[PDB]
Every structure is written in structure tokens, then in C-alpha cells.
């Protein structure tokens, strides 16, 4: 899967929901 589609916005498992 293309991991650049996930947007990591803080330490750990903190992502933006797209």
C-alpha cells in the first residue's frame, strides 16, 4: 500500500483522517 497517503501529524499513531 502507498504509505505516503497517510499523514502523520504527531508522535506515535497520530494521523489525520483523509
Amino acid at each position, epitope marked *: 500500500y*502507498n*504509505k*505516503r*497517503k*497517510r*499523514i*502523520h*501529524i*504527531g*508522535p506515535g499513531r*497520530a*494521523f*489525520y*483522517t*483523509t
Partner: antibody
Amino acid sequence: QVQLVQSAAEVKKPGEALKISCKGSGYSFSNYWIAWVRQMPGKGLEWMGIVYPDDSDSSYNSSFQGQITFSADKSISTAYLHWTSLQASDTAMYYCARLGFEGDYSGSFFDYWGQGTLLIVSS
Amino acid sequence: YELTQPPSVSVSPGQTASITCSGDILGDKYVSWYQQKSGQSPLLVIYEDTKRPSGIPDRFSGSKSGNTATLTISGTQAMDEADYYCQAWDSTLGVVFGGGTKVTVLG
């Protein structure tokens, strides 16, 4: 070197459609998200949304959903911001900006910005 | 929806300019800072709270304590006069900027 180069100033009327462009060079354009940012004169930066150029996936500030869409033409490394019906309040400066990478993922900062496109909307 | 910054900071050349940015999302979210000179595009000067891009002078530093991030410019120079914006991400609402701080280097 990474460059984002935006299309020229626009002067339009309310109700008209418009798309403005952001062409990225110096990297793999399809692989980095592009944000679009609005700045009314003398005011701050406001986020409109983001588009991923490899697949045109978009995420919007829902206050602008329904007035704007994004797209990308990967063959010429360009992303677009569209309106189908302008209003006078769309007068502002618009920037595109590249979201950078962190680790294996995209990151949280915009590491390169376009030079801006000034839009004036008036009857 | 904006993070909170002071509207204006004024310092003489050589003095430290300290710009704060606070918001309830900042404690666990990376803060970025951009410099926007008059008539120019924003330029990233700090990301992930404390990291400097290449080509940014070491006189710009960022820090963060709880819900408040601070951009410190030490040895401020005239060319550092600009508006500075902080930024972070709300997990569902996306990119949140501060309101901006106009830093004047007094001449």
C-alpha cells in the same frame, strides 16, 4: 531543487468558473500531497484542503466543500483548484504548498510553497 | 479555527523575539512555523516542533511546553522582520494555523 509555480493573477466575475494551477518540478509530483491555502489581504492563512496528485484523492475543509474541488494532471506535474461559481468573497491570494514526508509516511509540515495567485472577483 | 498567537512583537536588532502559539491540540501534535515577509509567500522555518530545514539560520529555534509552542529568534536581524504563523493538524478538521504575529525589527 523543488519548485512550485502557480498560474497568473486572475480577474473574474461572480458566477464564472475558474481553475488555477500549481506545477511542481524537481521531484516526483505524484507522490506528495498539495495543499491549497487562502489569504485575504492583510489577513492570515486559511486551509482549504489537500489533493494527492497520483490519484486525485482530496480532503477538504468542509466550510469550502461544495464551492471548490481539486484535481491533478500527472502528465504535466500540475495540481488545480477549481471553482464552478465564483463569488466576490473569493477575492484573495491563493497558495499551493507541498506537504513533506516523515519516516515512511507523509508528515505534518509544508516544506515548499508556490508564489501565490491573486484572484480578484468583481461584477 | 485558529491557534492563538500574540498579534505583534517588536524588538531592536540584536534582541530576542519570542513568539508563542497555543491551542488545546498542540500537546500531542507537531508544530510548524512559517515566515512570511511582506508581499512574499510563506517559508517553513521550523517543523516537528524543534527541527530547522536546511538553509534556515540557527538563530531560529522552536520549542514546546504542553499546549504552547514558542518560536525564538535570537540576535534578531532586520531581515527577520516578517509575519510568522504557527500551524498544526486537528485529527479530523485538518490544518490549523495560528492568527499570525507581525514581528517588526525596530529601525
